[PDB]
Design a protein around this ligand. Structure first.
Ligand SMILES: [Mg+2]
Ligand SMILES: [Mg+2]
Ligand SMILES: [Mg+2]
Ligand SMILES: [Mg+2]
Lengths: 282, 282, 291, 282
């Protein structure tokens, strides 16, 4: 099952697309629906015609419906350095200490209102000359840490603020339009091997590909199960929480995002998340 | 107006105690009341008798009511290094860089469910051998950054985890029972000079005063308005958001909290917050 | 548009079958949707498939969905003695009367018609759900009637079939027992759908048919056309709403003409089918109440 | 306990005044509170001061609080002829048939929105030339028929219509402002004998007593418990349903209500209900 959400006349509607391309309108809140699917693979709803899923992915708005975040995730967290100048402890840089350490990096990323979806604009802080989109795979957790599904997440980060001081990391991570995900949430059974997925980032600037990298999730060293273990340790999380797993694609200092740029991220079996950029004014 | 809340048989009731020992029971949600009082110093409610506010401060529970968090703050943030081995950037340590730098340390600290109050227990993480209570003055804010009131907050920190790597700061700060505040929220008018208050931390182990030490808020070199300025830059905060301003009282390596302790924090014009300590186990 | 409603896992879903047999699932409260449609003929919702409406009519239930009252009408009122009936010259020596003329035939000629309160939503049942005979009635009859769904201004939002189940023996004993005879658990039934106003060009040209079935055998049958109605619906509404504000989705049942005999009283296990032209067939089993 | 309700700034607040003058503000819905009191006589709430109950009875609106119906009864039913030209069955009149018969008159009277309270206007229908107030005792019921308390009720009746035809009875009983009750609901224990109570009806036209009359509830022949039995027979009623038990006081043909009149009704241990009279236009 792949789960998406639109806004129609000011209220939300959740739809599910099945492998046979039949679309179902959910009777339930989508978080509770993912929890139900997790138990018995059942979607409560009715089969609907006239929902143009493909046009929503390509055009965002069709008829009176516009695609958005697939859910409101009460909390969003992130893990850093899960894949293969700055501060440092005893010569060893703090980032490469984490890469070897038993304890991984876990940080708070967003609340639902700080997030955006397919077609909606991510944001660059007003006080940032070097903001980068971090293309990552993310998971939707229940309160026990069980994976309910996967989605594409964009951990937008003001890399210059982090670089100045690791104590600025929250400021570099947590702000309006600092997080994007979708276009859908795929249920767990849609992904057989999470550690064999391609992730392609593209940054379009004036109809022209300013950057393009990609990496497979087989390059991931820190396992997702372990990231969750540390997240929920003495730390109750609400159902529908999202954990973003980390990025490998990191454009250079000179590849900072700017107003009007289009960030396109593609992950295998999930889809392609497209978002414009909005530079904030002081 | 000094504002507190109780829990009675599964529901909350908010009371505002006024300059004169006359207690008023609120018609409104307590966060909204603070916004109204900030506007015109009006309070909606009936003058109540038979509410032993002083017995609640000492005993926590009287009859069928018990004191708790005065409000549910949708968000809690913190600001470190506001008053006068570890990592470093070009020799100079990360902490003493933030002190000198124009930008302060702002970090996400808590959500309502992770917060506790007078009489309720704060938590030491299962995997922390050195966790300290950081006594601080905290401000309740509206979404514009207007100081709706002051309170005593305990920013409970797993200092060992912080010391290992600054990137473990979120994990050291954000967990169940990592944050306590109360026993009241005082309105802006109750405090003439916020930089003229006596913060005192006491820790009681087995009836004996295991630690003591106080400081005045005149020693605070980072001004709260600056902290609020950076907190909200490009960062929409909800009404009732709490910003804890930083600590000056820092016990040593041998003075780490453990099960059954009693952490008492006093601030001038606000009162004394008392929370027993609870150790989490693996 | 014809409006129906199902229950599914303890919650309601409303559906609107359009004229080209396309089924739409309402995003709105059905009463809200009736009012919308009344203004501009629009229905908010997605076209759906797999909703086997014709099966819900015949079988009542399919998998986890079951048909019920098409709406919760906040109030239900009725208007008796609205059809043509000849001055039958020997009034039963027992009906209440005023200066010799029976109360029922005084209403017949009066300017003021009979208007009475019939039910709340929780006293109403739908297609496939059981109507009741009171535990203390030995002559309860179904009264097949055309009913209209009203807004607060008295505007007709649509029509449906209504069964005004009446403990006629209690009404016979004393007209002051009328409320006890009309108002009780399962005393009222409507559906299977609410058809919008435009689905009925002439409301005074519909065939109403009643069938009572006992153990497969057809116990009673009769019919009547609404061209026989004398007390017109516009008048019934005028008197209903006079100094008496009604909520949106109120239903006014407009009276019956099919009256089974004294020997044809309802009893347990019976089935009651009512058919009206352009609306459908309402079917309800009967339940006798135990003391 | 004696239970009343005000409207303050658009919302409702219910208060309980105990015999010893002490006024309690309720935590629960008043209907639920009455069911709790019926159980074990426990009342959840706080004692309050500054609520002048006696002045509210006399002034209706004090400052920004205004007394109204003590509860919203989901249903109101009536019962005629419980005490000592027209239609008739076998020469004998329909009313005295009911008086003797084992089955009493039970009829539906009002929905909550058709009811009014102390200080609010009852109505005379536009098409009625002889409307009389019927002062009656009334009981508040739970769904099992158990009496939760007593109150004054005015069954405002368009008598000319009832006279023309008893099939017009519902039109004479059910319309906007056809019912009034309060100012309080007294709990069951506040009345030791309901069959020994003085009911008094004053009507005030242009300064003067236009009608006065009274009668005790010892003249009531139809017992209340019987009326409740027939009400709930095969006929479930919601919690908070009111049953009014018929009137003994009946003014004559000349004493029909009209615009600007005032209706006072008094019953021992309950209080006095006052309502202006509005005549509807065409
Ligand atoms: Mg990252
Ligand atoms: Mg701190
Ligand atoms: Mg009828
Ligand atoms: Mg009466």
């Amino acid at each position: 099952m792949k789960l998406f959400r639109v806004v129609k006349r000011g209220y939300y509607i959740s739809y599910a697309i099945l492998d046979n391309s039949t679309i179902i309108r959910l009777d339930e809140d989508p978080i509770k629906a993912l929890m139900r699917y997790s138990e018995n693979k059942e979607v409560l709803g009715d089969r609907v015609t006239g929902i143009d899923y493909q046009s929503l992915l390509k055009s965002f708005q069709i008829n009176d419906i516009r695609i958005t975040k697939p859910i409101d995730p009460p909390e969003v967290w992130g893990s850093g350095i899960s894949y293969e100048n700055v501060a440092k402890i005893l010569g060893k840089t703090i980032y490469e200490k984490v890469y070897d350490a038993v304890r991984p990096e876990i940080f708070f990323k967003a609340t639902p209102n700080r997030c955006v979806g397919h077609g909606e604009a991510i944001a660059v802080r007003s006080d940032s000359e070097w903001t980068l989109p971090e293309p990552e795979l993310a998971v939707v957790l229940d309160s026990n840490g069980k994976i309910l599904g996967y989605t594409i997440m964009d951990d937008v980060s003001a890399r210059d603020l982090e670089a100045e001081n690791p104590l600025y990391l929250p400021q570099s991570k947590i702000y309006a339009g600092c997080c994007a995900f979708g276009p859908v949430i795929v249920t767990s059974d849609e992904i057989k091997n999470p550690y064999s997925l391609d992730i392609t980032l593209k940054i379009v600037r004036e109809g022209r590909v300013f950057f393009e990298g990609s990496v497979n999730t087989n390059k991931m060293r820190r396992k997702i199960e372990e990231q969750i273990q540390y997240l929920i340790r003495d730390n109750p999380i609400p159902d529908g929480t999202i954990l973003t797993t980390g990025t490998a694609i990191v454009p250079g200092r000179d590849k900072g995002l700017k107003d009007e740029d289009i960030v396109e991220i593609t992950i295998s079996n999930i889809g392609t998340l497209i978002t414009p950029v909005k530079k904030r004014r002081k």
